Short mmCIF file of all heavy atoms in Angstrom, two decimals:
data_model
loop_
_atom_site.label_atom_id
_atom_site.label_comp_id
_atom_site.label_asym_id
_atom_site.label_seq_id
_atom_site.Cartn_x
_atom_site.Cartn_y
_atom_site.Cartn_z
N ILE Q 9 -41.30 -9.40 43.95
CA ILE Q 9 -41.13 -8.05 44.47
C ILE Q 9 -39.73 -7.52 44.10
O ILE Q 9 -39.58 -6.36 43.68
CB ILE Q 9 -41.32 -8.03 46.00
CG1 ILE Q 9 -42.77 -8.40 46.34
CG2 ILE Q 9 -40.96 -6.68 46.58
CD1 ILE Q 9 -43.81 -7.53 45.67
N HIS Q 10 -38.72 -8.38 44.25
CA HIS Q 10 -37.35 -7.98 43.94
C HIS Q 10 -37.17 -7.61 42.47
O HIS Q 10 -36.43 -6.67 42.15
CB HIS Q 10 -36.35 -9.11 44.26
CG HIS Q 10 -34.93 -8.73 44.01
ND1 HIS Q 10 -34.24 -7.87 44.84
CD2 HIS Q 10 -34.10 -9.01 42.98
CE1 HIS Q 10 -33.04 -7.64 44.33
NE2 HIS Q 10 -32.93 -8.31 43.20
N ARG Q 11 -37.81 -8.36 41.59
CA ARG Q 11 -37.73 -8.12 40.15
C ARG Q 11 -38.45 -6.83 39.74
O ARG Q 11 -38.24 -6.32 38.64
CB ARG Q 11 -38.40 -9.26 39.38
CG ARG Q 11 -37.88 -10.65 39.66
CD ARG Q 11 -38.68 -11.67 38.85
NE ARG Q 11 -38.27 -13.05 39.10
CZ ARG Q 11 -37.06 -13.53 38.86
NH1 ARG Q 11 -36.12 -12.74 38.36
NH2 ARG Q 11 -36.78 -14.80 39.12
N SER Q 12 -39.29 -6.31 40.62
CA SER Q 12 -40.06 -5.10 40.31
C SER Q 12 -39.42 -3.81 40.78
O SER Q 12 -40.04 -2.74 40.70
CB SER Q 12 -41.47 -5.21 40.89
OG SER Q 12 -42.16 -6.36 40.42
N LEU Q 13 -38.19 -3.87 41.29
CA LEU Q 13 -37.54 -2.64 41.73
C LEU Q 13 -37.44 -1.71 40.53
O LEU Q 13 -37.23 -2.16 39.40
CB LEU Q 13 -36.15 -2.93 42.30
CG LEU Q 13 -36.09 -3.42 43.75
CD1 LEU Q 13 -34.66 -3.81 44.10
CD2 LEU Q 13 -36.60 -2.34 44.71
N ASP Q 14 -37.63 -0.41 40.78
CA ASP Q 14 -37.58 0.63 39.75
C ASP Q 14 -38.69 0.50 38.71
O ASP Q 14 -38.61 1.11 37.64
CB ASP Q 14 -36.21 0.63 39.06
CG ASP Q 14 -35.08 0.80 40.05
OD1 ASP Q 14 -35.09 1.81 40.79
OD2 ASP Q 14 -34.18 -0.07 40.09
N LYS Q 15 -39.72 -0.28 39.02
CA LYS Q 15 -40.84 -0.46 38.10
C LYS Q 15 -42.16 -0.05 38.76
O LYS Q 15 -42.30 -0.10 39.98
CB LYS Q 15 -40.91 -1.91 37.64
CG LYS Q 15 -39.72 -2.32 36.78
CD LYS Q 15 -39.96 -3.62 36.02
CE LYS Q 15 -39.91 -4.83 36.93
NZ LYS Q 15 -39.96 -6.13 36.19
N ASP Q 16 -43.13 0.37 37.94
CA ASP Q 16 -44.44 0.77 38.45
C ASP Q 16 -45.17 -0.46 39.00
O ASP Q 16 -45.15 -1.53 38.39
CB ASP Q 16 -45.28 1.41 37.33
CG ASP Q 16 -46.63 1.95 37.83
OD1 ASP Q 16 -46.65 2.98 38.54
OD2 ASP Q 16 -47.68 1.35 37.51
N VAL Q 17 -45.79 -0.30 40.17
CA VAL Q 17 -46.55 -1.39 40.77
C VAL Q 17 -47.85 -0.87 41.34
O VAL Q 17 -48.02 0.35 41.56
CB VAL Q 17 -45.80 -2.09 41.93
CG1 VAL Q 17 -44.51 -2.73 41.43
CG2 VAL Q 17 -45.50 -1.07 43.02
N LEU Q 18 -48.76 -1.80 41.59
CA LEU Q 18 -50.05 -1.51 42.19
C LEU Q 18 -50.06 -2.19 43.58
O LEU Q 18 -49.78 -3.39 43.68
CB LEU Q 18 -51.15 -2.12 41.32
CG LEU Q 18 -52.61 -2.04 41.78
CD1 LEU Q 18 -53.01 -0.59 42.01
CD2 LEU Q 18 -53.52 -2.68 40.72
N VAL Q 19 -50.33 -1.44 44.64
CA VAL Q 19 -50.40 -2.03 45.98
C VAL Q 19 -51.87 -1.95 46.41
O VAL Q 19 -52.39 -0.85 46.66
CB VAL Q 19 -49.51 -1.26 47.00
CG1 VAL Q 19 -49.63 -1.89 48.39
CG2 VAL Q 19 -48.04 -1.28 46.53
N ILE Q 20 -52.53 -3.10 46.46
CA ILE Q 20 -53.93 -3.20 46.85
C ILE Q 20 -54.07 -3.39 48.36
O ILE Q 20 -53.49 -4.32 48.94
CB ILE Q 20 -54.61 -4.39 46.14
CG1 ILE Q 20 -54.41 -4.28 44.63
CG2 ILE Q 20 -56.09 -4.42 46.47
CD1 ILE Q 20 -55.00 -5.45 43.85
N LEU Q 21 -54.82 -2.50 48.99
CA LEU Q 21 -55.02 -2.58 50.43
C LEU Q 21 -56.33 -3.30 50.75
O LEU Q 21 -57.19 -3.46 49.89
CB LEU Q 21 -55.00 -1.17 51.02
CG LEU Q 21 -53.72 -0.42 50.61
CD1 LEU Q 21 -53.90 1.05 50.84
CD2 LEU Q 21 -52.51 -0.97 51.38
N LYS Q 22 -56.46 -3.76 51.99
CA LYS Q 22 -57.65 -4.49 52.42
C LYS Q 22 -58.91 -3.63 52.44
O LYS Q 22 -59.77 -3.82 53.30
CB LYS Q 22 -57.41 -5.07 53.82
CG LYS Q 22 -56.05 -5.74 53.98
CD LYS Q 22 -55.87 -6.37 55.36
CE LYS Q 22 -54.49 -7.00 55.52
NZ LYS Q 22 -54.37 -7.74 56.82
N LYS Q 23 -59.05 -2.70 51.50
CA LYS Q 23 -60.21 -1.81 51.48
C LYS Q 23 -60.76 -1.41 50.10
O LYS Q 23 -61.66 -0.56 50.03
CB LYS Q 23 -59.89 -0.54 52.26
CG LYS Q 23 -59.41 -0.77 53.69
CD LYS Q 23 -60.56 -1.05 54.64
CE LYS Q 23 -61.43 0.19 54.83
NZ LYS Q 23 -62.51 -0.03 55.83
N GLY Q 24 -60.26 -1.99 49.02
CA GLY Q 24 -60.74 -1.58 47.70
C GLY Q 24 -60.17 -0.19 47.53
O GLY Q 24 -60.68 0.67 46.82
N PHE Q 25 -59.06 -0.02 48.24
CA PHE Q 25 -58.28 1.20 48.33
C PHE Q 25 -56.87 0.82 47.82
O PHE Q 25 -56.38 -0.26 48.14
CB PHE Q 25 -58.26 1.56 49.81
CG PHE Q 25 -57.55 2.82 50.15
CD1 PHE Q 25 -58.01 4.04 49.67
CD2 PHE Q 25 -56.47 2.80 51.02
CE1 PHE Q 25 -57.41 5.21 50.06
CE2 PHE Q 25 -55.86 3.96 51.42
CZ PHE Q 25 -56.32 5.17 50.95
N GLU Q 26 -56.22 1.69 47.05
CA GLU Q 26 -54.90 1.32 46.55
C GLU Q 26 -53.86 2.40 46.33
O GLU Q 26 -54.17 3.59 46.34
CB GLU Q 26 -55.04 0.49 45.26
CG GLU Q 26 -56.11 0.96 44.29
CD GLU Q 26 -56.36 -0.04 43.17
OE1 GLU Q 26 -56.73 -1.20 43.47
OE2 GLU Q 26 -56.20 0.32 41.98
N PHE Q 27 -52.61 1.97 46.18
CA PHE Q 27 -51.52 2.88 45.91
C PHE Q 27 -50.85 2.44 44.62
O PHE Q 27 -50.84 1.25 44.30
CB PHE Q 27 -50.46 2.86 47.02
CG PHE Q 27 -50.88 3.54 48.29
CD1 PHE Q 27 -51.19 2.79 49.42
CD2 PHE Q 27 -50.90 4.93 48.37
CE1 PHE Q 27 -51.51 3.42 50.62
CE2 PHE Q 27 -51.22 5.56 49.57
CZ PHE Q 27 -51.53 4.81 50.70
N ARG Q 28 -50.33 3.40 43.87
CA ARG Q 28 -49.62 3.09 42.64
C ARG Q 28 -48.39 3.97 42.64
O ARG Q 28 -48.45 5.14 43.01
CB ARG Q 28 -50.48 3.37 41.40
CG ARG Q 28 -51.86 2.73 41.47
CD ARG Q 28 -52.40 2.37 40.09
NE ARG Q 28 -51.68 1.23 39.52
CZ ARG Q 28 -52.06 0.57 38.43
NH1 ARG Q 28 -53.15 0.93 37.78
NH2 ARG Q 28 -51.34 -0.46 37.99
N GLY Q 29 -47.25 3.40 42.25
CA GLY Q 29 -46.02 4.17 42.23
C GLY Q 29 -44.87 3.32 41.76
O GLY Q 29 -45.05 2.17 41.38
N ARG Q 30 -43.67 3.90 41.77
CA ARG Q 30 -42.50 3.17 41.34
C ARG Q 30 -41.89 2.49 42.57
O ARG Q 30 -41.59 3.15 43.56
CB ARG Q 30 -41.48 4.12 40.69
CG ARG Q 30 -40.26 3.43 40.09
CD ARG Q 30 -39.41 4.40 39.30
NE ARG Q 30 -39.19 5.65 40.03
CZ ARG Q 30 -38.13 5.92 40.77
NH1 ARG Q 30 -37.15 5.03 40.89
NH2 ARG Q 30 -38.05 7.08 41.41
N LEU Q 31 -41.72 1.18 42.51
CA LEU Q 31 -41.13 0.46 43.65
C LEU Q 31 -39.64 0.75 43.81
O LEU Q 31 -38.85 0.47 42.92
CB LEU Q 31 -41.34 -1.05 43.48
CG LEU Q 31 -40.87 -1.94 44.65
CD1 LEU Q 31 -41.78 -1.73 45.88
CD2 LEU Q 31 -40.93 -3.40 44.20
N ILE Q 32 -39.22 1.30 44.96
CA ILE Q 32 -37.80 1.57 45.15
C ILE Q 32 -37.14 0.81 46.30
O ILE Q 32 -35.92 0.84 46.45
CB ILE Q 32 -37.52 3.09 45.32
CG1 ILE Q 32 -38.38 3.67 46.45
CG2 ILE Q 32 -37.82 3.82 44.01
CD1 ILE Q 32 -38.12 5.17 46.70
N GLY Q 33 -37.94 0.12 47.12
CA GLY Q 33 -37.37 -0.61 48.24
C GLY Q 33 -38.40 -1.52 48.87
O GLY Q 33 -39.60 -1.39 48.59
N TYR Q 34 -37.95 -2.47 49.69
CA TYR Q 34 -38.86 -3.39 50.34
C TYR Q 34 -38.08 -4.16 51.39
O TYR Q 34 -36.86 -4.06 51.45
CB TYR Q 34 -39.43 -4.38 49.31
CG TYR Q 34 -38.42 -5.36 48.75
CD1 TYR Q 34 -38.21 -6.61 49.35
CD2 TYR Q 34 -37.64 -5.02 47.64
CE1 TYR Q 34 -37.25 -7.49 48.85
CE2 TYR Q 34 -36.68 -5.90 47.14
CZ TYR Q 34 -36.49 -7.13 47.75
OH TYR Q 34 -35.53 -8.00 47.27
N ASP Q 35 -38.79 -4.89 52.24
CA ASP Q 35 -38.10 -5.73 53.22
C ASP Q 35 -38.83 -7.07 53.31
O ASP Q 35 -39.85 -7.28 52.65
CB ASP Q 35 -38.00 -5.05 54.59
CG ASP Q 35 -39.35 -4.73 55.20
OD1 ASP Q 35 -40.32 -5.48 54.94
OD2 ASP Q 35 -39.42 -3.74 55.95
N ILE Q 36 -38.30 -7.96 54.13
CA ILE Q 36 -38.87 -9.30 54.27
C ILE Q 36 -40.30 -9.39 54.82
O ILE Q 36 -40.94 -10.43 54.69
CB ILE Q 36 -37.93 -10.17 55.13
CG1 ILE Q 36 -38.42 -11.62 55.15
CG2 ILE Q 36 -37.87 -9.62 56.54
CD1 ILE Q 36 -38.61 -12.19 53.76
N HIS Q 37 -40.80 -8.31 55.41
CA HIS Q 37 -42.17 -8.31 55.95
C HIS Q 37 -43.14 -7.81 54.88
O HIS Q 37 -44.35 -7.70 55.10
CB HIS Q 37 -42.25 -7.39 57.17
CG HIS Q 37 -41.22 -7.68 58.21
ND1 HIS Q 37 -41.19 -8.87 58.91
CD2 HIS Q 37 -40.14 -6.98 58.62
CE1 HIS Q 37 -40.14 -8.89 59.70
NE2 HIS Q 37 -39.48 -7.75 59.54
N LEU Q 38 -42.59 -7.53 53.70
CA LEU Q 38 -43.35 -7.00 52.58
C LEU Q 38 -43.77 -5.55 52.81
O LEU Q 38 -44.78 -5.08 52.26
CB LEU Q 38 -44.56 -7.87 52.24
CG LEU Q 38 -44.22 -9.27 51.71
CD1 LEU Q 38 -45.51 -10.00 51.37
CD2 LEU Q 38 -43.32 -9.19 50.48
N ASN Q 39 -43.01 -4.84 53.63
CA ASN Q 39 -43.26 -3.40 53.80
C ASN Q 39 -42.62 -2.92 52.49
O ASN Q 39 -41.59 -3.46 52.07
CB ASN Q 39 -42.48 -2.81 54.98
CG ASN Q 39 -42.98 -3.32 56.32
OD1 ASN Q 39 -44.19 -3.44 56.54
ND2 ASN Q 39 -42.05 -3.59 57.24
N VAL Q 40 -43.23 -1.94 51.83
CA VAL Q 40 -42.65 -1.47 50.56
C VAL Q 40 -42.50 0.04 50.51
O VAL Q 40 -43.14 0.76 51.28
CB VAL Q 40 -43.49 -1.95 49.33
CG1 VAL Q 40 -43.46 -3.48 49.24
CG2 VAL Q 40 -44.93 -1.44 49.44
N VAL Q 41 -41.62 0.50 49.62
CA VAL Q 41 -41.39 1.93 49.47
C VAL Q 41 -41.66 2.27 48.02
O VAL Q 41 -41.13 1.63 47.12
CB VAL Q 41 -39.92 2.31 49.79
CG1 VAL Q 41 -39.75 3.82 49.66
CG2 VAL Q 41 -39.54 1.88 51.21
N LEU Q 42 -42.51 3.27 47.79
CA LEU Q 42 -42.83 3.69 46.44
C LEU Q 42 -42.39 5.14 46.27
O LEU Q 42 -42.36 5.91 47.24
CB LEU Q 42 -44.33 3.62 46.18
CG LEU Q 42 -45.05 2.29 46.43
CD1 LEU Q 42 -46.52 2.47 46.10
CD2 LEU Q 42 -44.45 1.20 45.58
N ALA Q 43 -42.02 5.48 45.03
CA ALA Q 43 -41.61 6.85 44.69
C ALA Q 43 -42.67 7.39 43.72
O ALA Q 43 -43.28 6.62 42.96
CB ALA Q 43 -40.23 6.84 44.02
N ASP Q 44 -42.90 8.71 43.75
CA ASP Q 44 -43.90 9.36 42.89
C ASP Q 44 -45.21 8.61 42.98
O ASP Q 44 -45.76 8.17 41.98
CB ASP Q 44 -43.43 9.40 41.43
CG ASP Q 44 -42.09 10.08 41.25
OD1 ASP Q 44 -41.87 11.15 41.87
OD2 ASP Q 44 -41.26 9.56 40.49
N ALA Q 45 -45.71 8.47 44.20
CA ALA Q 45 -46.93 7.71 44.45
C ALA Q 45 -48.23 8.50 44.48
O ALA Q 45 -48.24 9.71 44.72
CB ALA Q 45 -46.79 6.92 45.77
N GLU Q 46 -49.32 7.77 44.28
CA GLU Q 46 -50.66 8.33 44.33
C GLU Q 46 -51.59 7.33 45.02
O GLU Q 46 -51.51 6.12 44.80
CB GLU Q 46 -51.16 8.65 42.92
CG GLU Q 46 -51.19 7.47 41.96
CD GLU Q 46 -50.90 7.88 40.52
OE1 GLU Q 46 -49.74 8.27 40.24
OE2 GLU Q 46 -51.81 7.81 39.68
N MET Q 47 -52.45 7.85 45.89
CA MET Q 47 -53.43 7.02 46.57
C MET Q 47 -54.68 7.03 45.69
O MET Q 47 -55.18 8.10 45.31
CB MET Q 47 -53.74 7.58 47.95
CG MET Q 47 -54.89 6.88 48.65
SD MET Q 47 -55.32 7.74 50.17
CE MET Q 47 -53.83 7.48 51.13
N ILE Q 48 -55.17 5.85 45.35
CA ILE Q 48 -56.35 5.73 44.52
C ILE Q 48 -57.53 5.22 45.33
O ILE Q 48 -57.41 4.22 46.04
CB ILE Q 48 -56.09 4.77 43.34
CG1 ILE Q 48 -54.96 5.32 42.46
CG2 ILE Q 48 -57.37 4.57 42.54
CD1 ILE Q 48 -55.21 6.72 41.94
N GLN Q 49 -58.66 5.91 45.22
CA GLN Q 49 -59.88 5.54 45.94
C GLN Q 49 -61.04 5.49 44.96
O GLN Q 49 -61.40 6.51 44.37
CB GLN Q 49 -60.19 6.56 47.03
CG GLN Q 49 -61.46 6.25 47.80
CD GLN Q 49 -62.14 7.50 48.32
OE1 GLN Q 49 -63.12 7.42 49.06
NE2 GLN Q 49 -61.63 8.67 47.93
N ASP Q 50 -61.64 4.32 44.80
CA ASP Q 50 -62.76 4.16 43.89
C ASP Q 50 -62.41 4.67 42.49
O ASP Q 50 -63.24 5.30 41.83
CB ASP Q 50 -63.99 4.90 44.42
CG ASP Q 50 -64.59 4.24 45.66
OD1 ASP Q 50 -63.84 4.04 46.64
OD2 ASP Q 50 -65.80 3.94 45.65
N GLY Q 51 -61.18 4.41 42.06
CA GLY Q 51 -60.76 4.84 40.73
C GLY Q 51 -60.12 6.20 40.57
O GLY Q 51 -59.58 6.50 39.50
N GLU Q 52 -60.14 7.05 41.60
CA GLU Q 52 -59.54 8.37 41.44
C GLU Q 52 -58.40 8.73 42.39
O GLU Q 52 -58.32 8.21 43.51
CB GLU Q 52 -60.64 9.45 41.48
CG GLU Q 52 -61.36 9.61 42.82
CD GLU Q 52 -62.77 10.13 42.64
OE1 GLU Q 52 -62.98 11.04 41.80
OE2 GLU Q 52 -63.67 9.64 43.35
N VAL Q 53 -57.52 9.61 41.93
CA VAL Q 53 -56.38 10.05 42.71
C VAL Q 53 -56.83 11.01 43.81
O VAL Q 53 -57.41 12.06 43.54
CB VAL Q 53 -55.36 10.77 41.80
CG1 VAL Q 53 -54.20 11.32 42.63
CG2 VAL Q 53 -54.86 9.82 40.73
N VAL Q 54 -56.54 10.66 45.06
CA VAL Q 54 -56.95 11.53 46.16
C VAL Q 54 -55.78 12.08 46.96
O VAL Q 54 -55.96 12.96 47.81
CB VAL Q 54 -57.96 10.82 47.10
CG1 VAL Q 54 -59.20 10.44 46.31
CG2 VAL Q 54 -57.33 9.58 47.73
N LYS Q 55 -54.58 11.58 46.67
CA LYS Q 55 -53.35 12.04 47.33
C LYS Q 55 -52.14 11.66 46.47
O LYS Q 55 -52.19 10.72 45.67
CB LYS Q 55 -53.20 11.40 48.72
CG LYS Q 55 -54.24 11.79 49.76
CD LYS Q 55 -53.79 12.95 50.65
CE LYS Q 55 -52.71 12.51 51.63
NZ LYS Q 55 -52.54 13.45 52.79
N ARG Q 56 -51.05 12.40 46.63
CA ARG Q 56 -49.82 12.12 45.91
C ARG Q 56 -48.68 12.26 46.89
O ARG Q 56 -48.74 13.07 47.82
CB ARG Q 56 -49.62 13.07 44.72
CG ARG Q 56 -50.45 12.66 43.51
CD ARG Q 56 -50.23 13.56 42.30
NE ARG Q 56 -51.19 13.24 41.25
CZ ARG Q 56 -51.49 14.05 40.24
NH1 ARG Q 56 -50.90 15.23 40.12
NH2 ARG Q 56 -52.40 13.67 39.35
#
C-alpha cells in the first residue's frame, strides 16, 4: 500500500462493487484515500 502512493489503484469491495483512483493516503486499518476517483458497478462508472 505504501509503495502505491500517488499511483492508480483498484479497491474491491465485498460486493463485486469497486473504486478506482489515485492513492494519496492510508492508515494502519487500511482505510484509504483516493483522488480523482470513480465508483464502478458491474463494469461501469456510476459516480466520481
Side-chain angles (χ1 to χ4, degrees):
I9 295 305
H10 182 74
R11 304 178 182 299
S12 303
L13 279 174
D14 304 304
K15 294 195 287 188
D16 184 71
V17 297
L18 176 57
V19 179
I20 306 177
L21 306 163
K22 315 183 182 186
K23 305 281 292 184
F25 182 63
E26 40 190 59
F27 286 107
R28 309 210 71 169
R30 185 172 46 96
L31 185 69
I32 54 178
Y34 68 92
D35 61 31
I36 187 54
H37 308 295
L38 294 182
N39 291 319
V40 296
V41 182
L42 305 180
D44 303 317
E46 58 213 68
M47 172 188 294
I48 298 304
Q49 179 210 186
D50 290 54
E52 66 208 319
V53 176
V54 299
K55 294 265 288 198
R56 281 182 188 161

